[PDB]
């Protein structure tokens, strides 16, 4: 137990995910003995595997792993290069672990590239669940599934920071705290279109609030009914966003400021 390794967590159940960048390009057998080699201890791969061109396994001992991030630029293959070792601190070899793979980031990324445009700062993400290129490719960027949206809002501050018209229309997203940041990540964005998305309340826009818009949408989002007139759907919506001028494709009276 304690001191050396308590039978339970919070204490010393310390896991590690050691990743050999490009491991595939080497023999599982050769590659590993070559580590133990340049190594200083006896390390055992806790379920090694291939994530595309990825080489990775787990390590229980905190310091075992320690002597592995020590073996970097250490091995020199036949091609005469250096095999790498991305060593990290982690969770049990199988837990809640939701996330995704980096191959897909490049998936999601390429898909977006064709769905963008640098003359209208487009970002038509009509059906990120339904778009060829990935449709029938086992994967589906489920934006409402938190991280996906995260990793989606990721590519933007990275590639397209200036974007002006993002469009989630129809991606059945509901609670907005996921993308509750694009205000920072995607600064200008003078337009949006959270239409179709099963948004039940106006309590969402409270999350985009700071986003300085001028054009939005929202039909088919439960919240519609949660309203009577138009005078306030124009006052609730416009509340969260004053500079608002257009809306759901119609004539929004010249916003009269006091």
Q: Are 141 and 175 a contacting pair, CB within 8 Å?
A: no
Residue 139, CB half-sphere, CA atoms under 13 Å: how many?
16
* Strands lying side by side in the sheet with 15-20: 49-51, 54-59, 15-20, 86-90
Q: What is the DSSP letter of 104?
A: H
Resolution (in Å) of the shown entry? 3.8
CATH label of the domain that carries residue 73:
3.30.70.330
**Residue 102 class from Cβ within 10 Å (0-12 exposed, 13-18 middle, 19+ buried)?**
exposed
Same domain? For 89 and 140 the reply is no
236's CB contacts (< 8 A; 6+ apart) are 202, 205, 227
Euclidean distance between the first and the last CA atom of the chain, given in angstroms as a whole number? 69
Quote the distance between the C-alpha of residue 18 and its chain's center. 22
Of 35, 62, 97, the residue at which a domain comes to its end is: 97
19/50 Cα distance (integer angstroms): 10
Look at residues 61, 79, 97 and tell me which one is the last residue of a structural domain: 97
- CA distances for 190 relative to 121, 202, 218, 242, angstroms: 10, 19, 15, 12
Half-sphere exposure in the Cβ direction for 95 (13 Å, CA): 6
Residues 76 and 104 placed together within one structural domain of the fold? no
Residue 230: give its domain's CATH number: 3.80.10.10
Question: How would you class 112 by CB atoms within 10 Å of its CB: exposed for 0-12, middle for 13-18, buried for 19 or more?
Answer: buried
My answer on whether 117 and 199 are in the same domain is yes
d(CA 246, CA 253): 9
Pairing mode, strands 246-247 and 82-83: unpaired
Question: Do 167 and 189 share a structural domain?
Answer: yes
Q: Which domain holds residue 180?
A: 98-258
Residues 13 and 111 in one domain: no
Same domain, 106 and 201: yes
CA distance 87 to 72: 10
Same domain flag for 76 and 194: no
Return the residue matching tokens 């291939």: 50
The answer to whether the CB of 111 falls within 8 A of the CB of 133 is yes
Neighbours of 99 (CB within 10 A): 11
Q: How many domains does the chain have?
A: 2
Domain boundary among 48, 75, 97: 97
């Amino acid at each position: 137990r304690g001191g050396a390794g308590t039978s339970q967590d919070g204490t010393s159940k310390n896991w590690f995910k050691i990743t050999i960048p490009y491991g595939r390009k080497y023999d599982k057998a050769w590659l590993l003995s070559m580590i133990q080699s340049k190594c200083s201890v006896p390390f055992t791969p806790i379920e090694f595997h291939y994530e595309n061109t990825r080489a990775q396994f787990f390590v229980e001992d905190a310091s075992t792993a320690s002597a592995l991030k020590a073996v970097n630029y250490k091995i020199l293959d036949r091609e005469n290069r250096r095999i790498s070792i991305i060593i990290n601190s982690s969770a049990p070899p199988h837990t809640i672990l939701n996330e995704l793979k980096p191959e897909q980031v490049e998936q999601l990324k390429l898909i977006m590239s064709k769905r963008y445009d640098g003359s209208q700062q487009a970002l038509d993400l009509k059906g990120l669940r339904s778009d060829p290129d990935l449709v029938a490719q086992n994967i589906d960027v489920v934006l409402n599934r938190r991280s996906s949206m995260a990793a989606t809002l990721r590519i933007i501050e990275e590639n397209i920071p200036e974007l002006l018209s993002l469009n989630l229309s129809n991606n059945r997203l509901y609670r907005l705290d996921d993308m509750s940041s694009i205000v920072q990540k995607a600064p200008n964005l003078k337009i949006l279109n959270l239409s179709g998305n099963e948004l039940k309340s106006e309590r969402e826009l409270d999350k985009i609030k700071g986003l300085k818009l001028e054009e939005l949408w929202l039909d088919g989002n439960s919240l519609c009914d949660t309203f009577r007139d138009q005078s306030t759907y124009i006052s609730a919506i416009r509340e969260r966003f004053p500079k608002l001028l257009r809306l759901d494709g119609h004539e929004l009276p010249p916003p009269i400021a006091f």
